[PDB]
Amino acid sequence: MEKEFEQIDKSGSWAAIYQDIRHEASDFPCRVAKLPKNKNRNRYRDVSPFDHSRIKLHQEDNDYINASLIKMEEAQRSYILTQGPLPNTCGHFWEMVWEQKSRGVVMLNRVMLKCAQYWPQKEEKEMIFEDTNLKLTLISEDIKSYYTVRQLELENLTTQETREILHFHYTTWPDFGVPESPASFLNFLFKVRESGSLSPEHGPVVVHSSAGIGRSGTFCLADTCLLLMDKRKDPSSVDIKKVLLEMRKFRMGLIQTADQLRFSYLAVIEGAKFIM
Numbered sequence: 599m600e601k602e603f604e605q606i607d608k609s610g611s612w613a614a615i616y617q618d619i620r621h622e623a624s625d626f627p628c629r630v631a632k633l634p635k636n637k638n639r640n641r642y643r644d645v646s647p648f649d650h651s652r653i654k655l656h657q658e659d660n661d662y663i664n665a666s667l668i669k670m671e672e673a674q675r676s677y678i679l680t681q682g683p684l685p686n687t688c689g690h691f692w693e694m695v696w697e698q699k700s701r702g703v704v705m706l707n708r709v710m711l712k713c714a715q716y717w718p719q720k721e722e723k724e725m726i727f728e729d730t731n732l733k734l735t736l737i738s739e740d741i742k743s744y745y746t747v748r749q750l751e752l753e754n755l756t757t758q759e760t761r762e763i764l765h766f767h768y769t770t771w772p773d774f775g776v777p778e779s780p781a782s783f784l785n786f787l788f789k790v791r792e793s794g795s796l797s798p799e800h801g802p803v804v805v806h807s808s809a810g811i812g813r814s815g816t817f818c819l820a821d822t823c824l825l826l827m828d829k830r831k832d833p834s835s836v837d838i839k840k841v842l843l844e845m846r847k848f849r850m851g852l853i854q855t856a857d858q859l860r861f862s863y864l865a866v867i868e869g870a871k872f873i874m
Contacts (some may be wrong), residue, residue: 600836616856619839626650636662637812639690641681641713643649645809651848653678655690656697657730661692664810666849667802668818673825676802677818679849681810682713689727692734693761695804696754696849698870702795702803705767706813712773713808717750717765731755744770744782747789766790771813776857780865784872787821796821815852816862819845823866828873838866 606612615749630636631646639662640646646664647653653665665680665685682705683691709715710839718725718736725734733755739748745762748765768786770777777783790796795803807813823841842862845852853859 599836599838601865603867604861607860612860614682615839616853616859619842619846619859622843623850624648624843625850626836626847628850629870631664633662635660638684639687640664641684642809643849645681645811647849653680653694653698654691654865655730657693662821663687663694663765665804665830666810667695668845668848670822672846673829674798675796675822675823675825677811678802678804679814679818679852680804680806682707682806682808683716685714688716689729689732691804692727692732692752692839693730696732696752696761698804700763700804701761701797701800702764702766702790702793703763704795704803704805704814704817705789706771706805706807706817707773708769708771713806717748726755739765744768745786745789764793764795766793767812773808774812774855776855777862780861783817783820783861783865784869787817787824787869788872792798798845809851809854811849811851812854812858815842815845815849815854816858816865819862820865820869823862824869827870832872833874838863 606615626648628646644780647666651666654661655663665678668677706714721736733753735751737749737751746767750763753760754765791826802817804813817844823836823838826836
């Protein structure tokens with residue numbers, strides 16, 4: 599399957615292959631995302647959850663967040679892909695994490711102005727979201743060369759229940775851009791895996807980036823292809839293009855560039871050297 603990459607790379611036809619996928623992509627209504635009232639709940643006019651797959655906040659007021667549940671049946675893995683929270687939607691965001699029983703949050707964009715800072719910078723400075731009634735405290739953070747992992751405590755003030763959330767932040771990935779190498783990213787991925795944040799025991803991990811489509815789509819596409827190869831009887835059968843289009847049924851626009859598409863291949867290619 600490496601060869602297929604070799605065929606596109608040598609052809610230098612990557613832009614075309616990305617366009618094929620785009621044409622072949624799903625389309626579904628986005629009636630709620632487009633509601634006049636939800637206008638400021640979306641970071642981008644051009645990026646919206648399909649109505650069928652959108653996550654619903656369970657609190658009475660309004661049930662809308664710009665998030666999509668991606669369900670991959672064969673791989674038995676689920677992802678929530680969402681836009682980087684707006685200053686108004688932080689409360690909503692944390693509510694979705696509580697309600698969906700998520701143990702992990704994967705962030706693939708730098709704060710630089712792509713996304714609000716929705717988590718506590720200091721332990722001493724915990725956050726309260728009065729709209730959704732959630733208190734968030736930063737327990738601990740470990741900073742590394744390529745990424746940061748933080749341990750947070752999200753407490754539902756209503757129920758006085760507590761949950762430990764692990765925050766995984768890839769800090770070296772530029773917007774609309776690709777990391778210099780797949781291994782740094784793959785290492786990031788296994789760290790996320792190792793933590794169990796992707797276990798079926800827990801709710802679907804929340805993955806986000808600025809738009810919640812390109813960087814995030816790469817992370818999810820990569821993990822799934824690699825999962826499939828492990829699970830499957832013949833690993834050679836796994837087709838990235840097939841996998842990407844299945845995900846795009848759940849959320850529009852996953853993987854935004856030809857450059858991202860090439861990277862997913864490289865990452866998946868390098869990733870399965872490891873698994874194998």
